[PDB]
Ligand binder design. Sequence first.
Ligand SMILES: O=C([O-])CCCCCNC(=O)Cc1ccc(O)c([N+](=O)[O-])c1
Lengths: 118, 110
Amino acid sequence: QVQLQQPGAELVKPGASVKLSCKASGYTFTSYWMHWVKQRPGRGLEWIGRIDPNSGGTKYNEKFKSKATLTVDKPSSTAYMQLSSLTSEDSAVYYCARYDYYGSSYFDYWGQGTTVTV
Amino acid sequence: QAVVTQESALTTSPGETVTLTCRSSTGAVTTSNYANWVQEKPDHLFTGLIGGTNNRAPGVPARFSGSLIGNKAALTITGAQTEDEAIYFCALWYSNHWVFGGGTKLTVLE
Ligand SMILES: O=C([O-])CCCCCNC(=O)Cc1ccc(O)c([N+](=O)[O-])c1
């Protein structure tokens, strides 16, 4: 019973930043990587970026650089992702998912996703 | 930069076998690209099936298996059951980023 908890939604007027959270439980947090993914019909899965709990270090999709800000909270076992100026593209689902940097190389557990409707 | 291509949709029938593939704009796909198959079930639900080209996610019904078929990453379903209707994504790790394929709708029982 591994689990990644993400709040359901966000409803905001254009050009309005939002901090997104993702809680992990049932396993050892800092031992796995955290990746944020975006969905929106057309195919929809675009990789926003990764964060290494330990390090605080990230690797972002260069497309989302002047946009998204990744951070974590080690004690609460919570991953974050900020979005600056929701220009309004952004009306999409934002997922948090588990990734085995030290492992079997799969995105096994996924979060339910935080929907963002601008 | 790179583009990951999968079949848009495959139609199958119960008790039959079906294969889905994942292609790269780079060149052949090999064990090095780190082919992962993600399963999306109706109403935005995801679960990894394979990872590391051929490593099944725990719980996933044995009828599923990854491998490489030539220059492409692949997913095989044996005796496709109705519970396999879903959208199958593949993803590839190219140097400094992951790129997801467009996704394959797998219409089990067509
Ligand atoms: O390579 C082997 O020898 C076997 C297991 C290692 C699997 C390779 N996976 C990776 O390390 C890919 C890899 C690299 C850097 C990086 O930042 C990320 N990421 O953010 O998810 C993945």
